[PDB]
Amino acid sequence: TMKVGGNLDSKGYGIATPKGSSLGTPVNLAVLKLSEQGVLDKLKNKWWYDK
Amino acid sequence: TMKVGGNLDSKGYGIATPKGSSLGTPVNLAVLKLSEQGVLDKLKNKWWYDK
Amino acid sequence: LVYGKADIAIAPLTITLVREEVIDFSKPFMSLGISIMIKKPQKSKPGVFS
Amino acid sequence: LVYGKADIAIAPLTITLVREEVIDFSKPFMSLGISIMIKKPQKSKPGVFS
Ligand SMILES: *[C@@]1(Cl)=[C]C2=C([C]=C1S([N])(=O)=O)S(=O)(=O)[N][C]([C]1[C][C]3[C][C]1[C]=[C]3)[N]2
Numbered sequence: 001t002m003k004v005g006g007n008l009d010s011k012g013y014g015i016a017t018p019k020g021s022s023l024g025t026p027v028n029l030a031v032l033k034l035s036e037q038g039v040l041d042k043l044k045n046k047w048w049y050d051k
Numbered sequence: 052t053m054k055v056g057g058n059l060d061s062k063g064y065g066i067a068t069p070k071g072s073s074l075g076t077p078v079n080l081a082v083l084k085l086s087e088q089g090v091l092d093k094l095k096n097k098w099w100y101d102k
Numbered sequence: 103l104v105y106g107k108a109d110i111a112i113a114p115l116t117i118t119l120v121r122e123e124v125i126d127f128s129k130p131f132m133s134l135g136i137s138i139m140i141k142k143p144q145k146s147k148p149g150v151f152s
Numbered sequence: 153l154v155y156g157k158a159d160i161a162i163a164p165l166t167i168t169l170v171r172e173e174v175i176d177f178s179k180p181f182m183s184l185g186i187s188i189m190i191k192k193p194q195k196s197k198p199g200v201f202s
């Protein structure tokens with residue numbers, strides 16, 4: 001089974017919390033650290049391409 | 052000139068506001084709505100490929 | 103999340119605007135889109151005139 | 153933004169940690185990461201007697 005066609009829209013995932021939960025801000029601050037560190041794609045490599 | 056390969060990184064553009072300004076959430080809601088309304092991709096088509 | 107059964111969601115739960123009406127999504131960790139899956143095309147004999 | 157002179161940045165503006173430290177950014181609208189610009193190596197050309 002195989003992918004056909006391109007992706008339809010500019011969408012994505014997000015970490016989520018109850019609205020106004022204290023976790024949302026440190027999560028968001030964490031994400032922009034993880035991104036420049038390359039962790040976000042490194043995990044993707046580990047869980048798609050290395051498998 | 053040619054773009055070699057694909058994206059090197061996750062670098063992206065978002066809408067920015069002074070910290071704590073009330074503009075944040077309604078602008079977010081609007082920009083999210085545009086993604087499902089297709090307006091963002093329609094604009095991208097206009098501004099890179101229609102032109 | 104809404105009824106307090108959990109403190110945070112960490113899963114491929116997709117961002118949608120209607121969900122963010124009741125929860126907060128963070129900045130995304132990657133982009134992706136809707137796609138179609140089918141059984142892949144085969145490899146088979148070219149035409150007689152090939 | 154940090155000096156309060158203007159109110160909103162609808163702009164070709166990168167979200168980064170070193171910026172969100174002092175200002176807010178919305179969810180980003182499209183993926184547009186780094187690439188390397190090269191000049192093209194002239195162009196291919198068929199020949200009358202190639
Ligand atoms: C990465 Cl490393 C990070 C992010 C995305 C995609 C990648 S990649 N190169 O495909 O592996 S994302 O899902 O497109 N969204 C980004 C946002 C984070 C942050 C805001 C946006 C851009 C910075 N993470």
Ligand SMILES: NS(=O)(=O)c1cc2c(cc1Cl)N[C@H]([C@H]1C[C@H]3C=C[C@@H]1C3)NS2(=O)=O
Pocket residue numbers: 009010011012013063064083086091092095117130133179180181182183184
């Ligand atoms: N197809 S595209 O390059 O113009 C593009 C790129 C991006 C888009 C939308 C589009 Cl259409 N929005 C996503 C976000 C919007 C919402 C949906 C996912 C995230 C939340 N991030 S993005 O990666 O910054």
